[PDB]
């Protein structure tokens, strides 16, 4: 689970259930090559684009499939309206 | 782990996972010659330059490979644009 939409730049508190016997990791990639956190609920900071985590739980040394969540970004609100030069 | 870009003159607070029968080591030198700290999450003041951490536990009388992390100190901001002599 994220926390919600990120404003562009902006850090994610993501987060799982908890699992006794249990090691937890999280990966940027879907290959699970990149690594970005070993906790339970870790944060993410500089999130600018939407990007996908993935979650592998081992347990007594065997390994789930990846388990992943999205996060979305808000959108850059317009520039505002001023008027024309004084 | 490290905590992102450090500011230069800041501090770090380096992360790991928790290990039950663990003792916990941390070594700015990648020899393990200097010794920093000794505890799960440490931190470590008056980073000014990029410097790298080495981490050891020692698990029930082993000791496993140092592993290790990069700490990189954001660029010096540019010197502002102040007019000429009034």
Request: net charge negative; charged share 5%; hydrophobic share 35%.
């Amino acid at each position: 689970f994220n926390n919600g939409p990120v404003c562009r730049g902006s850090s994610v508190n993501l987060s799982t259930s908890f699992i006794s016997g249990a090691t937890y990791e999280w990966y940027a990639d879907a290959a699970l090559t990149i690594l970005v956190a070993t906790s339970q609920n870790p944060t993410i900071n500089n999130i600018t684009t939407d990007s996908t985590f993935y979650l592998v739980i081992t347990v007594n040394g065997c390994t789930s499939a990846a388990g992943a969540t999205t996060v979305v970004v808000h959108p850059t609100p317009t520039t505002p309206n001023v008027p024309s030069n004084i």
